[PDB]
Amino acid sequence: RIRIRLKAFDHRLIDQATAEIVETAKRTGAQVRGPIPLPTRKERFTVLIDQYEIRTHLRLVDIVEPTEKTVDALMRLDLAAGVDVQISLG
Amino acid sequence: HYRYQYTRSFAERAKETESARLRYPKHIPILCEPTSVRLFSTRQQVQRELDCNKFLLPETATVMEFMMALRQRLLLEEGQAVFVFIGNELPPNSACLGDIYARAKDPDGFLYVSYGVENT
Amino acid sequence: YRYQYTRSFAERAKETESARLRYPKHIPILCEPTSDCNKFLLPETATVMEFMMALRQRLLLEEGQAVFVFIGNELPPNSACLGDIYARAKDPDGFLYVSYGVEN
């Protein structure tokens, strides 16, 4: 089992990266659970001498039953530079 | 499949849901287990058993209501979300348990659900 | 809202300031029937949907009956977060005013 967590400031990039990972897993005959959207993270900087807000969007994808071809394909995936990805194996 | 189906005979699971439906014919019996061998411990079995939660919820209850019941039962903190799956699919929050049950119930009478907890 | 007419703005400001000291991550909600106030505190992370489901239990509602809520003239999205809503729609008195109703 390959669990994938994505984070980005831009939700447009995160949904595209997520769809791209899902598709890739499916094309190589794996099972996918998700995408699972998690609640957006909301941080704020108070400007002194007025708020600046940073939101971090979050998505999870579980790949179940990764094939030889699944991992190989994930390694070759060209993911947008603004999306951070974390992977843990089962 | 699910741990509950390996450790309980079909006969006892079927009887269990038969009794539930005889008394509560408009309720849905639900069996939830986590989405999750020299990897063994004397603790492993009791802890796996305690991860399995059963519910008996109205057919008119929504997925969201179920998820809130599961949250309460798992006593999750502020930084924790629970998400649920039916056979790899994540059901819509406004779906009724009775509609999901009609389509996805096991032959033994339970609606089987995988849950994952995420620590946002 | 009736509550705005029966309680002075100063008293209402006091209630919310006080609830937000005791519960900084909770949103004060004033709830009235769409033409009988109740006050609620809601985790700032709860959604409209979660709130509607909590509110449903809160009432002696029979199965098949659902709550709907307005915030102003708008039916908010189910998946919308209450903290996001609170930040754009709270009253100057600090309350988020919500009107609710029941449908079959």
UniProtKB/Swiss-Prot annotation, chain A:
Fetch the Gene3D superfamilies from UniProt. Ribosomal protein S10 domain
Q: Which GO terms describe its molecular function?
A: structural constituent of ribosome; transcription antitermination factor activity, RNA binding; tRNA binding
Set out the biological process GO terms recorded for this chain's protein.
cytoplasmic translation; regulation of DNA-templated transcription elongation; ribosome biogenesis; transcription antitermination
Matches recorded under SMART domains: Ribosomal_S10
Q: Which domain of life is it from?
A: Bacteria
Which key words tag this protein in UniProt?
A: Ribonucleoprotein, Ribosomal protein, Ribosome biogenesis, RNA-binding, Transcription, Transcription antitermination, Transcription regulation
**One Pfam family, short name:** Ribosomal_S10
Decide whether keyword Transcription regulation is in the record.
yes
PROSITE patterns recorded for this chain? Answer: RIBOSOMAL_S10 (PS00361)
UniProt GO cellular component terms:
cytoplasm; cytosol; cytosolic small ribosomal subunit; small ribosomal subunit; transcription elongation factor complex
**UniProt keyword Transcription regulation present:** yes
Tell me the protein family, please.
Answer: Belongs to the universal ribosomal protein uS10 family.
Q: Give a short account of what the protein does.
A: Involved in the binding of tRNA to the ribosomes. Part of the processive rRNA transcription and antitermination complex (rrnTAC). The complex forms an RNA-chaperone ring around the RNA exit tunnel of RNA polymerase (RNAP). It supports rapid transcription and antitermination of rRNA operons, cotranscriptional rRNA folding, and annealing of distal rRNA regions to allow correct ribosome biogenesis. In complex with NusB is involved in the regulation of ribosomal RNA (rRNA) biosynthesis by transcriptional antitermination.
What is the protein's quaternary organization?
Part of the 30S ribosomal subunit. Can also form a heterodimer with the transcription antitermination protein NusB. Binding of S10 to NusB is mutually exclusive with its incorporation into the ribosome. The rRNA transcription and antitermination complex (rrnTAC) consists of RNAP, NusA, NusB, NusE (this protein), NusG, SubB, ribosomal protein S4, DNA and precursor rRNA; S4 is more flexible than other subunits.
UniProt-recorded name of the protein: Small ribosomal subunit protein uS10
Q: Which species is listed as the source?
A: Escherichia coli (strain K12)
Q: Identify the taxonomic lineage of the organism of origin.
A: Bacteria, Pseudomonadati, Pseudomonadota, Gammaproteobacteria, Enterobacterales
Encoding gene (name): rpsJ
